[PDB]
């Protein structure tokens, strides 16, 4: 049925109790629990509606079960109403769903109040009732939804609900591009450094580690993350979910920490350049990246596979047990423990050592007025690094801290978006740390093959 699909993209789906536009406790696919501000009253109504102790959380099956009931209860409410029934009978299948939509939203006795537009609706004068419905509180309260229902009423088509498919297939396109950019980018980088011995420097050994983490992310994390979002489900095991999210945290931790290692690498190459090649050896270099991945392993696979990350609230417990749920619920402890160890500590180090580099550049910039190309290009690169890095990961790791401190603040969608903003940073890294003339030559050679 189309009325079922229509309401699914009008009410969405939330397995936990939330507040709708009017501030009423709602759950599932737009099922009003109570018009009272009492959470306990809402939780009691949910328990009665489902038939078990819910803790404010239901399942997807229980959501569609309540959904089908609410739709049926709306149709019955129309047929029993003596002012709505002649209109419903008059309307076609598509326009019927539009009427069911309003009743689903405002109730049978609430829709019946629209005397003027109900008349114009039965008279089949669509364009009249179209602008007549716009002059109501229902339109002012929910502008985006009312326009979709009114459009369906005056056209008799589903063109108003055709946007959802466009944004999905469009998002599927841009996700494919991201995956392609990350893989093509980092493969080209790792290949170039490996094949050509001239590029194998101490600094560029760190970039290989970075490009490796970024590569695995573009191969393992991002593609399966795109499928999880587009299909709106997880078509793999609970094992594969716990394995996939491990690679997520592992690669992110490795990627960000390696960015920090590069930063400290340049710190010694700028502040104490005469000791640089003595402090940082090829041997010490691989020792550092060993520690990076060793650490990253202890923040990803160890806490996750041992179920130390797991939260304790009901929605998490249901998610962990559901073979089609792969939402990343974490306890407050692991969240802030993994956040500081995979971002904030690298951040404060990165800001410190780059502040010092900023000083050393400005200091030399004061000595001579012209021909300061080295310091100018340093400052410019310095901006691009801290710019794209913080702009990509800081918002995510801010809301990552917030959502485990005060819930009902950070939405699911915005956690995903800001996390994917961090994902594309893996695609940006080959555009930042591989700009050298020797990289450009190595790239024009591999692509000319």
């Amino acid at each position: 049925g189309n009325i079922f699909e229509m309401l699914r993209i009008d009410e969405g789906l939330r397995l936990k109790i939330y507040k709708d536009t009017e501030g009423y406790y709602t759950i599932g696919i737009g099922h009003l629990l109570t018009k009272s501000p009492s959470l306990n009253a809402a939780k009691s109504e949910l328990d009665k509606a489902i038939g078990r102790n819910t803790n404010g959380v239901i399942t997807k099956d229980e959501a569609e079960k309540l959904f089908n009931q609410d739709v049926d209860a709306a149709v019955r409410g129309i047929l029993r109403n003596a002012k709505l029934k002649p209109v419903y009978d008059s309307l076609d299948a598509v326009r019927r769903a539009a009427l069911i939509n309003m009743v689903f939203q405002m109730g049978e006795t609430g829709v019946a109040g629209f005397t003027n537009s109900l008349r114009m609706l039965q008279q089949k004068r669509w364009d009249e009732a179209a602008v007549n419905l716009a002059k109501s509180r229902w339109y002012n309260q929910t502008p985006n939804r009312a326009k979709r229902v009114i459009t369906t009423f005056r056209t008799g088509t589903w063109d108003a609900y055709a946007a959802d498919e466009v944004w999905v297939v469009g998002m599927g396109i841009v996700m494919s591009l991201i995956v392609l950019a990350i893989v093509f980018g980092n493969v080209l980088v790792i290949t170039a450094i490996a094949k050509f011995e001239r590029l194998q420097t101490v600094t560029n050994y760190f970039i290989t580690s970075l490009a490796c983490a970024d590569l695995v992310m573009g191969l393992a994390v991002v593609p399966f993350g795109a499928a999880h979002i587009l299909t709106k489900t997880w078509t793999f095991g609970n094992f594969w979910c716990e394995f996939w999210t491990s690679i997520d945290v592992l690669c992110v931790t490795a990627s960000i920490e390696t960015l920090c290692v590069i930063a400290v690498d340049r710190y010694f190459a700028i502040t104490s350049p005469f000791k640089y090649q003595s402090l940082l050896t090829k041997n010490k270099a691989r020792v550092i990246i060993l520690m990076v991945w060793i650490v990253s392993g202890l923040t990803s696979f160890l806490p996750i596979q041992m179920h130390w990350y797991r939260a304790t609230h009901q929605e998490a417990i249901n998610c962990y047990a559901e073979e089609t749920c792969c939402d990343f619920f974490t306890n407050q402890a692991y969240a802030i423990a993994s956040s500081i160890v995979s971002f904030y500590v690298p951040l404060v180090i990165m800001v410190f050592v780059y502040s010092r580099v900023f000083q050393e550049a400005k200091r030399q910039l004061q000595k001579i007025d012209k021909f300061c190309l080295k310091e100018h290009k340093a400052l410019k690169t310095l901006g691009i690094i801290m710019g794209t890095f913080t702009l990509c990961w800081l918002p995510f790791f801010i809301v990552n801290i917030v959502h485990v401190i005060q819930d009902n603040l950070i939405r699911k969608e915005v956690y995903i978006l800001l996390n994917w903003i961090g994902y594309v940073n893996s695609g940006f890294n080959p555009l930042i740390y591989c700009r050298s003339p020797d990289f450009r030559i190595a790239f024009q050679e591999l692509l000319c093959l």
Partner: nanobody, 116 residues
Framework: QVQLQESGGGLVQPGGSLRLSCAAS????????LRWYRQAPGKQHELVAG???????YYADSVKGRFTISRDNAKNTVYLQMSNLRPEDTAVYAC??????????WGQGTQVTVSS
């Protein structure tokens, strides 16, 4: 990998002259900015001379007029001809090629000691 080897340092009478050579191998030399740095014992390192890709040379106030830096792209070598040397010029002189923040390569550095 990238390599910068200095040669031409050592001992020299005060007022004497030395010529530092810096051989480069492993990168696109011609499109790199070259500088000569030095570091006296127990002191902060300082810039001696520098030459751009265009050929623009710039020097420190203390060695201006005495030292002369030049570059040979055909041989991937940058030189630092330094005359009228002084006991203050006694330091470890290092070669440095640079493109951006990450493409910054240094030499091992050669010791120049000036005394009578």
């Amino acid at each position: 990998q990238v390599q910068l080897q200095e040669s031409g340092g050592g001992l020299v009478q005060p007022g004497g002259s030395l010529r530092l050579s810096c051989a480069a191998s492993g990168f696109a030399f011609s499109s790199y900015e070259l500088r000569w740095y030095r570091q006296a014992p127990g002191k902060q390192h300082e810039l001696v001379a520098g030459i751009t890709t265009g050929g623009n040379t710039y020097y420190a106030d203390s060695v201006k007029g005495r030292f002369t830096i030049s570059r040979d792209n055909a041989k991937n070598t940058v030189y630092l001809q330094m005359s009228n040397l002084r006991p203050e010029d006694t330091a470890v002189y290092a070669c440095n090629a640079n493109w951006d923040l990450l493409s910054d390569y240094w030499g091992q550095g050669t010791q120049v000691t000036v005394s009578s």
